[PDB]
Protein backbone atom coordinates (compact mmCIF):
# COMPACT_ATOMS: atom_id res chain seq x y z
CA UNK A 1 0.00 0.00 0.00
CA UNK A 2 2.17 3.20 -1.42
CA UNK A 3 1.43 6.11 -0.65
CA UNK A 4 -0.42 7.93 -4.43
CA UNK A 5 2.52 10.35 -4.41
CA UNK A 6 3.06 9.31 -7.92
CA UNK A 7 -0.67 11.05 -9.28
CA UNK A 8 0.03 14.08 -7.24
CA UNK A 9 3.53 14.97 -8.42
CA UNK A 10 3.56 13.42 -11.85
CA UNK A 11 0.39 14.92 -12.71
CA UNK A 12 -0.17 16.42 -16.67
CA UNK A 13 -1.90 19.57 -15.00
CA UNK A 14 -1.55 21.26 -12.21
CA UNK A 15 -4.36 23.95 -10.39
CA UNK A 16 -3.74 27.56 -10.74
CA UNK A 17 -2.46 29.34 -7.69
CA UNK A 18 -5.85 30.62 -6.89
CA UNK A 19 -7.70 27.47 -6.88
CA UNK A 20 -5.10 25.15 -5.42
CA UNK A 21 -6.18 21.55 -5.19
CA UNK A 22 -6.20 20.04 -1.72
CA UNK A 23 -5.29 15.86 -1.25
CA UNK A 24 -5.66 13.93 1.89
CA UNK A 25 -2.87 10.71 2.14
CA UNK A 26 -3.89 8.67 4.63
CA UNK A 27 -3.37 4.54 5.15
CA UNK A 28 -0.40 3.81 3.06
CA UNK A 29 3.43 3.76 3.54
CA UNK A 30 5.27 6.93 2.23
CA UNK A 31 8.34 6.88 0.54
CA UNK A 32 11.01 10.56 -0.47
CA UNK A 33 13.69 8.29 -1.91
CA UNK A 34 11.26 8.49 -5.36
CA UNK A 35 10.88 12.48 -5.31
CA UNK A 36 13.99 12.33 -7.33
CA UNK A 37 13.01 10.38 -10.48
CA UNK A 38 9.87 11.96 -10.58
CA UNK A 39 10.86 15.82 -9.55
CA UNK A 40 13.84 16.93 -11.34
CA UNK A 41 15.42 19.90 -9.89
CA UNK A 42 13.47 19.33 -6.44
CA UNK A 43 13.79 21.97 -3.92
CA UNK A 44 12.71 20.54 -0.62
CA UNK A 45 13.90 23.74 2.05
CA UNK A 46 11.11 22.42 5.02
CA UNK A 47 9.71 23.46 8.29
CA UNK A 48 8.87 21.77 10.91
CA UNK A 49 10.78 18.50 11.09
CA UNK A 50 14.35 17.49 9.98
CA UNK A 51 14.00 15.97 6.32
CA UNK A 52 16.59 14.06 7.20
CA UNK A 53 15.02 11.42 9.32
CA UNK A 54 11.75 11.59 7.54
CA UNK A 55 12.22 7.97 7.03
CA UNK A 56 11.44 6.29 10.43
CA UNK A 57 8.52 8.72 11.71
CA UNK A 58 4.77 8.20 11.65
CA UNK A 59 2.37 11.02 10.56
CA UNK A 60 -1.00 11.53 11.71
CA UNK A 61 -2.57 12.90 8.26
CA UNK A 62 -1.31 14.75 5.46
CA UNK A 63 -2.79 16.85 3.12
CA UNK A 64 -0.94 17.71 0.11
CA UNK A 65 -1.32 21.36 -2.14
CA UNK A 66 -0.20 21.99 -5.44
CA UNK A 67 -0.29 24.53 -7.57
CA UNK A 68 1.93 26.30 -10.34
CA UNK A 69 3.54 29.70 -9.74
CA UNK A 70 6.44 31.97 -11.17
CA UNK A 71 9.93 31.10 -10.19
CA UNK A 72 10.93 34.14 -8.28
CA UNK A 73 7.93 34.16 -6.36
CA UNK A 74 8.97 30.60 -4.64
CA UNK A 75 9.88 32.73 -1.86
CA UNK A 76 6.76 33.54 -0.96
CA UNK A 77 5.72 29.74 -0.07
CA UNK A 78 6.64 30.18 3.99
CA UNK A 79 5.14 30.78 7.17
CA UNK A 80 5.28 34.67 8.21
CA UNK A 81 5.76 35.73 4.39
CA UNK A 82 4.10 38.76 2.88
CA UNK A 83 3.33 39.49 -0.54
CA UNK A 84 1.19 39.10 -3.70
CA UNK A 85 1.30 35.39 -3.67
CA UNK A 86 1.08 35.03 0.46
CA UNK A 87 -1.72 37.34 1.04
CA UNK A 88 -4.15 36.59 -2.30
CA UNK A 89 -3.63 33.14 -3.17
CA UNK A 90 -1.94 31.08 -0.31
CA UNK A 91 -1.36 31.97 3.15
CA UNK A 92 0.28 29.61 5.56
CA UNK A 93 -0.35 29.20 9.21
CA UNK A 94 2.59 30.65 11.33
CA UNK A 95 3.00 27.63 13.23
CA UNK A 96 3.25 25.23 10.57
CA UNK A 97 4.72 21.89 9.95
CA UNK A 98 4.96 19.98 6.92
CA UNK A 99 7.59 20.35 4.13
CA UNK A 100 7.53 22.14 0.56
CA UNK A 101 9.16 21.12 -2.44
CA UNK A 102 9.44 23.32 -5.39
CA UNK A 103 10.32 21.75 -8.91
CA UNK A 104 11.03 24.28 -12.62
CA UNK A 105 8.67 22.64 -15.30
CA UNK A 106 9.86 24.77 -18.24
CA UNK A 107 9.82 22.11 -20.38
CA UNK A 108 6.32 20.68 -19.15
CA UNK A 109 4.07 24.24 -19.15
CA UNK A 110 5.63 26.67 -21.34
CA UNK A 111 4.17 26.80 -24.69
CA UNK A 112 5.95 28.74 -27.95
CA UNK A 113 2.12 30.74 -28.35
CA UNK A 114 2.54 31.40 -24.35
CA UNK A 115 0.68 30.19 -21.67
CA UNK A 116 -2.78 31.39 -20.52
CA UNK A 117 -4.15 29.06 -18.70
CA UNK A 118 -2.62 30.18 -15.88
CA UNK A 119 -4.34 32.33 -13.66
CA UNK A 120 -3.39 34.18 -9.93
CA UNK A 121 -5.88 36.86 -8.19
CA UNK A 122 -4.48 40.27 -8.18
CA UNK A 123 -7.20 42.14 -6.01
CA UNK A 124 -8.85 41.48 -2.80
CA UNK A 125 -10.33 43.53 -0.05
CA UNK A 126 -8.21 41.82 2.67
CA UNK A 127 -5.63 39.09 2.91
CA UNK A 128 -6.54 35.44 3.45
CA UNK A 129 -6.35 33.91 6.57
CA UNK A 130 -4.14 30.84 6.55
CA UNK A 131 -5.91 28.06 4.41
CA UNK A 132 -8.89 29.52 2.57
CA UNK A 133 -9.12 29.41 -1.25
CA UNK A 134 -11.32 32.42 -3.18
CA UNK A 135 -12.63 30.96 -5.80
CA UNK A 136 -15.08 34.40 -6.43
CA UNK A 137 -14.94 36.47 -9.82
CA UNK A 138 -16.67 39.76 -8.83
CA UNK A 139 -15.41 43.04 -10.36
CA UNK A 140 -13.17 44.78 -8.24
CA UNK A 141 -14.28 48.10 -7.38
CA UNK A 142 -11.01 50.26 -6.86
CA UNK A 143 -12.42 54.05 -7.38
CA UNK A 144 -15.82 55.50 -5.58
CA UNK A 145 -18.44 55.04 -8.42
CA UNK A 146 -19.98 51.22 -8.61
CA UNK A 147 -18.70 48.75 -11.07
CA UNK A 148 -21.65 47.78 -11.84
CA UNK A 149 -20.05 44.59 -13.81
CA UNK A 150 -18.71 46.86 -16.22
CA UNK A 151 -14.80 46.54 -16.05
CA UNK A 152 -13.89 50.15 -16.84
CA UNK A 153 -11.07 51.92 -15.86
CA UNK A 154 -11.23 51.82 -11.41
CA UNK A 155 -13.01 48.40 -12.15
CA UNK A 156 -10.31 45.68 -12.81
CA UNK A 157 -10.79 41.74 -12.72
CA UNK A 158 -9.22 40.41 -10.10
CA UNK A 159 -7.52 37.63 -11.58
CA UNK A 160 -4.59 37.97 -14.19
CA UNK A 161 -3.02 35.11 -16.29
CA UNK A 162 1.09 34.39 -15.77
CA UNK A 163 2.64 35.78 -18.76
CA UNK A 164 5.80 33.37 -18.46
CA UNK A 165 9.13 34.42 -20.45
CA UNK A 166 11.16 31.82 -20.89
CA UNK A 167 13.79 33.83 -22.43
CA UNK A 168 14.13 35.75 -19.04
CA UNK A 169 15.96 34.15 -16.31
CA UNK A 170 14.40 31.59 -13.65
CA UNK A 171 12.65 34.04 -12.23
CA UNK A 172 10.20 34.16 -15.20
CA UNK A 173 9.91 30.66 -15.12
CA UNK A 174 6.79 28.12 -14.20
CA UNK A 175 7.79 26.03 -10.97
CA UNK A 176 5.50 23.47 -9.61
CA UNK A 177 5.24 23.42 -6.26
CA UNK A 178 3.45 20.63 -3.91
CA UNK A 179 3.51 21.67 0.09
CA UNK A 180 2.61 18.56 2.46
CA UNK A 181 0.83 19.53 5.47
CA UNK A 182 1.62 17.26 8.45
CA UNK A 183 0.95 17.11 12.22
CA UNK A 184 0.62 14.70 15.40
CA UNK A 185 -2.50 14.33 17.10
CA UNK A 186 -4.99 12.18 19.43
CA UNK A 187 -5.10 9.46 16.56
CA UNK A 188 -2.96 6.87 15.98
CA UNK A 189 -0.43 6.85 13.45
CA UNK A 190 -1.68 5.67 10.30
CA UNK A 191 1.10 7.33 7.47
CA UNK A 192 4.68 5.82 8.21
CA UNK A 193 7.78 5.77 6.54
CA UNK A 194 9.57 2.80 4.90
CA UNK B 1 -7.95 25.89 -42.90
CA UNK B 2 -10.28 23.12 -42.88
CA UNK B 3 -10.28 18.94 -41.60
CA UNK B 4 -13.23 17.19 -43.87
CA UNK B 5 -13.65 14.06 -43.20
CA UNK B 6 -14.15 10.88 -45.41
CA UNK B 7 -15.12 7.25 -45.24
CA UNK B 8 -18.51 7.54 -43.90
CA UNK B 9 -20.85 4.75 -44.43
CA UNK B 10 -23.18 2.19 -43.89
CA UNK B 11 -21.92 -0.65 -41.92
CA UNK B 12 -23.35 -4.04 -41.58
CA UNK B 13 -23.46 -4.93 -37.74
CA UNK B 14 -20.47 -6.67 -37.04
CA UNK B 15 -18.19 -5.52 -39.18
CA UNK B 16 -15.32 -2.46 -39.30
CA UNK B 17 -14.68 0.48 -40.90
CA UNK B 18 -11.60 3.05 -41.24
CA UNK B 19 -12.61 6.61 -41.07
CA UNK B 20 -10.28 9.45 -42.61
CA UNK B 21 -9.21 12.82 -41.56
CA UNK B 22 -7.51 15.16 -43.50
CA UNK B 23 -5.75 18.55 -43.14
CA UNK B 24 -6.42 21.31 -45.58
CA UNK B 25 -3.81 24.64 -45.21
CA UNK B 26 -1.82 23.13 -43.25
CA UNK B 27 0.30 20.17 -42.33
CA UNK B 28 0.74 18.21 -38.65
CA UNK B 29 2.87 20.16 -36.76
CA UNK B 30 4.35 19.00 -33.40
CA UNK B 31 3.03 21.68 -31.54
CA UNK B 32 -0.98 20.54 -31.82
CA UNK B 33 -3.04 17.81 -30.40
CA UNK B 34 -5.65 15.72 -32.90
CA UNK B 35 -8.90 14.03 -31.37
CA UNK B 36 -11.85 12.30 -32.57
CA UNK B 37 -14.71 12.47 -31.12
CA UNK B 38 -18.73 11.46 -32.00
CA UNK B 39 -22.56 12.48 -31.15
CA UNK B 40 -25.40 10.30 -31.40
CA UNK B 41 -27.90 11.77 -33.33
CA UNK B 42 -29.98 13.15 -30.52
CA UNK B 43 -27.75 12.52 -27.30
CA UNK B 44 -25.00 14.76 -26.38
CA UNK B 45 -20.93 14.67 -27.01
CA UNK B 46 -19.01 11.49 -26.43
CA UNK B 47 -14.96 11.88 -26.99
CA UNK B 48 -13.45 8.78 -28.05
CA UNK B 49 -9.68 9.36 -28.93
CA UNK B 50 -6.36 11.44 -29.17
CA UNK B 51 -3.09 11.24 -30.54
CA UNK B 52 -0.17 13.74 -30.81
CA UNK B 53 1.30 14.63 -33.78
CA UNK B 54 4.82 15.24 -32.38
CA UNK B 55 7.80 12.74 -31.78
CA UNK B 56 5.98 10.37 -29.49
CA UNK B 57 2.73 9.97 -30.26
CA UNK B 58 0.76 10.15 -26.39
CA UNK B 59 -2.62 7.80 -27.51
CA UNK B 60 -5.42 8.03 -25.16
CA UNK B 61 -8.46 5.93 -25.56
CA UNK B 62 -12.19 6.69 -23.87
CA UNK B 63 -12.82 4.20 -21.33
CA UNK B 64 -15.92 2.92 -23.17
CA UNK B 65 -13.62 1.79 -26.30
CA UNK B 66 -10.83 0.79 -24.53
CA UNK B 67 -10.07 -1.73 -26.96
CA UNK B 68 -12.79 -1.61 -30.01
CA UNK B 69 -10.75 1.42 -31.46
CA UNK B 70 -7.87 2.36 -32.77
CA UNK B 71 -6.28 5.50 -33.99
CA UNK B 72 -3.09 5.83 -36.34
CA UNK B 73 -1.31 8.80 -38.08
CA UNK B 74 -0.35 7.99 -41.70
CA UNK B 75 1.37 10.73 -43.49
CA UNK B 76 2.02 14.69 -43.23
CA UNK B 77 -1.87 15.27 -43.46
CA UNK B 78 -3.83 12.23 -42.81
CA UNK B 79 -4.99 10.65 -39.50
CA UNK B 80 -7.10 7.64 -39.48
CA UNK B 81 -9.70 6.24 -37.54
CA UNK B 82 -10.38 2.30 -37.62
CA UNK B 83 -13.07 0.92 -35.14
CA UNK B 84 -14.15 -2.85 -35.53
CA UNK B 85 -17.63 -4.66 -35.04
CA UNK B 86 -19.75 -1.69 -35.04
CA UNK B 87 -23.21 -2.67 -33.42
CA UNK B 88 -26.38 -0.50 -33.82
CA UNK B 89 -25.58 1.98 -31.04
CA UNK B 90 -22.50 3.03 -33.19
CA UNK B 91 -24.06 5.52 -35.46
CA UNK B 92 -23.56 8.59 -34.74
CA UNK B 93 -21.26 11.49 -36.26
CA UNK B 94 -18.16 11.90 -36.16
CA UNK B 95 -15.84 15.12 -35.87
CA UNK B 96 -12.17 15.53 -36.25
CA UNK B 97 -11.12 18.22 -34.01
CA UNK B 98 -7.83 20.17 -33.21
CA UNK B 99 -6.74 20.61 -29.82
CA UNK B 100 -4.63 23.66 -28.68
CA UNK B 101 -1.93 22.49 -26.43
CA UNK B 102 -0.07 18.94 -26.42
CA UNK B 103 -0.79 18.00 -22.22
CA UNK B 104 -1.46 14.14 -23.58
CA UNK B 105 -4.78 14.81 -23.63
CA UNK B 106 -7.69 16.61 -25.53
CA UNK B 107 -7.55 20.33 -23.88
CA UNK B 108 -9.92 22.76 -25.59
CA UNK B 109 -10.88 22.58 -29.28
CA UNK B 110 -9.92 25.34 -30.87
CA UNK B 111 -11.36 24.11 -34.40
CA UNK B 112 -13.36 21.49 -35.45
CA UNK B 113 -13.90 19.56 -39.09
CA UNK B 114 -17.44 19.27 -40.57
CA UNK B 115 -17.71 15.67 -39.59
CA UNK B 116 -19.17 12.44 -41.33
CA UNK B 117 -22.39 10.17 -40.63
CA UNK B 118 -21.49 6.57 -39.92
CA UNK B 119 -24.79 4.48 -39.87
CA UNK B 120 -25.20 0.68 -38.97
CA UNK B 121 -28.01 -1.01 -39.71
CA UNK B 122 -29.06 -4.53 -41.80
CA UNK C 1 -11.82 9.67 -12.72
CA UNK C 2 -13.77 12.61 -13.05
CA UNK C 3 -17.21 12.72 -14.25
CA UNK C 4 -19.38 15.66 -14.12
CA UNK C 5 -23.07 16.89 -14.47
CA UNK C 6 -24.94 19.53 -16.65
CA UNK C 7 -28.44 21.05 -15.42
CA UNK C 8 -30.54 21.45 -16.49
CA UNK C 9 -31.23 19.08 -19.30
CA UNK C 10 -33.55 22.03 -20.54
CA UNK C 11 -34.71 26.03 -20.30
CA UNK C 12 -36.98 28.39 -21.47
CA UNK C 13 -37.31 31.97 -21.24
CA UNK C 14 -38.58 35.06 -23.34
CA UNK C 15 -36.13 37.23 -25.04
CA UNK C 16 -35.24 39.38 -22.58
CA UNK C 17 -34.41 37.28 -19.53
CA UNK C 18 -30.74 35.96 -18.89
CA UNK C 19 -30.32 32.32 -18.30
CA UNK C 20 -27.93 30.36 -16.24
CA UNK C 21 -26.39 26.78 -17.23
CA UNK C 22 -24.51 24.79 -14.17
CA UNK C 23 -22.01 22.09 -14.63
CA UNK C 24 -20.19 20.57 -11.31
CA UNK C 25 -17.21 17.68 -11.49
CA UNK C 26 -17.10 14.91 -9.13
CA UNK C 27 -13.92 16.24 -7.75
CA UNK C 28 -11.78 20.05 -7.72
CA UNK C 29 -10.69 20.75 -11.73
CA UNK C 30 -9.22 23.97 -10.74
CA UNK C 31 -9.43 25.95 -13.50
CA UNK C 32 -9.85 23.39 -16.63
CA UNK C 33 -12.83 23.88 -18.25
CA UNK C 34 -14.60 24.49 -21.46
CA UNK C 35 -17.99 25.98 -22.42
CA UNK C 36 -19.13 25.02 -26.39
CA UNK C 37 -22.26 25.61 -28.05
CA UNK C 38 -23.50 23.70 -31.12
CA UNK C 39 -26.30 24.98 -33.13
CA UNK C 40 -28.54 22.17 -34.49
CA UNK C 41 -26.65 21.15 -38.07
CA UNK C 42 -23.25 22.18 -36.92
CA UNK C 43 -19.74 21.60 -35.52
CA UNK C 44 -19.73 23.03 -31.62
CA UNK C 45 -18.12 26.26 -31.21
CA UNK C 46 -16.14 27.21 -28.62
CA UNK C 47 -17.29 30.29 -26.22
CA UNK C 48 -15.28 30.24 -22.77
CA UNK C 49 -12.45 28.55 -22.30
CA UNK C 50 -10.53 29.07 -19.17
CA UNK C 51 -13.65 28.77 -17.30
CA UNK C 52 -13.68 32.89 -17.91
CA UNK C 53 -11.60 33.89 -20.70
CA UNK C 54 -14.51 34.65 -23.92
CA UNK C 55 -12.99 33.16 -27.03
CA UNK C 56 -12.19 35.01 -30.38
CA UNK C 57 -14.97 36.74 -32.14
CA UNK C 58 -17.31 35.33 -29.23
CA UNK C 59 -20.12 38.38 -28.39
CA UNK C 60 -19.92 39.67 -24.74
CA UNK C 61 -22.64 38.22 -23.06
CA UNK C 62 -21.45 35.03 -22.06
CA UNK C 63 -20.33 35.23 -18.84
CA UNK C 64 -18.39 32.45 -17.02
CA UNK C 65 -17.85 31.74 -13.18
CA UNK C 66 -17.39 29.73 -10.36
CA UNK C 67 -14.31 27.34 -10.05
CA UNK C 68 -13.18 24.18 -8.11
CA UNK C 69 -16.12 21.98 -8.78
CA UNK C 70 -19.15 23.91 -9.59
CA UNK C 71 -19.34 26.34 -12.81
CA UNK C 72 -21.97 28.40 -14.51
CA UNK C 73 -22.33 29.75 -17.82
CA UNK C 74 -24.99 32.85 -17.79
CA UNK C 75 -26.57 34.58 -20.87
CA UNK C 76 -27.52 38.23 -19.98
CA UNK C 77 -29.50 38.64 -23.10
CA UNK C 78 -30.83 36.29 -25.95
CA UNK C 79 -31.71 37.43 -29.14
CA UNK C 80 -33.14 34.01 -30.88
CA UNK C 81 -30.17 33.56 -32.24
CA UNK C 82 -28.67 31.69 -29.25
CA UNK C 83 -30.97 28.92 -29.14
CA UNK C 84 -28.46 26.09 -29.45
CA UNK C 85 -27.19 23.68 -27.17
CA UNK C 86 -24.18 24.04 -24.86
CA UNK C 87 -22.09 22.04 -22.76
CA UNK C 88 -18.64 21.97 -20.30
CA UNK C 89 -15.83 19.99 -21.05
CA UNK C 90 -13.05 19.18 -17.95
CA UNK C 91 -9.54 19.58 -19.64
CA UNK C 92 -7.88 18.20 -16.88
CA UNK C 93 -7.40 14.80 -16.78
CA UNK C 94 -7.90 12.79 -19.10
CA UNK C 95 -6.11 9.29 -18.57
CA UNK C 96 -9.25 7.03 -17.67
CA UNK C 97 -12.44 8.78 -18.11
CA UNK C 98 -15.67 7.90 -19.73
CA UNK C 99 -16.24 11.21 -21.71
CA UNK C 100 -14.88 14.72 -21.33
CA UNK C 101 -17.74 16.22 -22.13
CA UNK C 102 -20.95 16.51 -19.71
CA UNK C 103 -24.18 16.47 -20.93
CA UNK C 104 -26.09 18.52 -23.20
CA UNK C 105 -28.65 21.51 -21.97
CA UNK C 106 -30.75 22.71 -25.23
CA UNK C 107 -31.57 26.14 -24.70
CA UNK C 108 -35.62 27.61 -25.99
CA UNK C 109 -35.69 31.29 -26.89
CA UNK C 110 -39.43 31.88 -27.00
CA UNK C 111 -39.50 35.16 -28.65
Known amino acids: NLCPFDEVFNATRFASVYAWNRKRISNCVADYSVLYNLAPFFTFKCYGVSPTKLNDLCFTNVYADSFVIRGDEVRQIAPGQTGNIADYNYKLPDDFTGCVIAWNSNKLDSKVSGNYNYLYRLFRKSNLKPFERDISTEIYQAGNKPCNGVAGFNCYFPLRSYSFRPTYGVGHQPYRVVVLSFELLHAPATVCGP | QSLEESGGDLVKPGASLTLTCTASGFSFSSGYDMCWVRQAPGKGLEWIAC????????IYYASWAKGRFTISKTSSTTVTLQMTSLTAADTATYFC???????????????WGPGTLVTVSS | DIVMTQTPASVSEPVGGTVTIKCQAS??????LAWYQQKPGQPPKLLIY???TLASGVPSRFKGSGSGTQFTLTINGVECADAATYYCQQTYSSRDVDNVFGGGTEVVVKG
Open chain 3, 50 to 52: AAF
Open chain 3, 27 to 32: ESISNW
Open chain 2, 51 to 58: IGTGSSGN
Open chain 2, 97 to 111: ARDDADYAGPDYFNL
